[PDB]
Amino acid sequence: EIIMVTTGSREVDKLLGGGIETGSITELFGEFRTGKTQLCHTLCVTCQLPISQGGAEGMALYIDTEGTFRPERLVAVAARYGLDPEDVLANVACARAFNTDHQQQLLLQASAMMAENRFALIVVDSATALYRTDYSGRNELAARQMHLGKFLRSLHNLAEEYGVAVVVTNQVSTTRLSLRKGRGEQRIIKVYDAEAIFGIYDDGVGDA
């Protein structure tokens, strides 16, 4: 029931034992421009790839709280994997929620969508931009970390129930990965415990 979604980089997948595991929450920790969003975009297409190709053969649910979701990037990634861009764009559902009111309803909607159709990955970029304001939207939210914790708990339940991979990004069962900047435009990833170098290109995350 647990499948590994290729990250687009053989080295990274090798370190991750195949890639992003399904049925669990994988937290990506990294500063700005570490490739957290770019990684999510690549995964939103790889999740649709055939199992043989390291995919979960499923759709992707993208919860954008940073407003950095760009469907065009998915198209470029699709080209690399020889997948019809129209289909990949239709196989990725995205909800751009910055207010807590909408963010609070996304989980419920996600469950219904996953119950009605087959999804393989749920992306949350980013948890940092989540629950910034209170329910009214007028003020700051008290004890945000407590609210965020409950969100992740329910997200883990969806992960276990619908057996979908969940990648949650954080600026600066849960598998925690840290992202960093390499010698040049290369990136380094390692588990919080042994490191791998990957690159960010038009076609998306890859090796070298």
Binding site: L74, V88, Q109, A112
Partner: peptide, 23 residues
């Protein structure tokens, strides 16, 4: 009877779900 969602396809198509599913 379907219900609207905040989600939409990257192609721009709005996403809906049956109320019973939300139930």
């Amino acid at each position: 009877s379907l219900v609207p969602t905040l989600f939409s396809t990257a192609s721009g198509k709005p996403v809906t779900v049956r109320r019973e599913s939300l139930q």
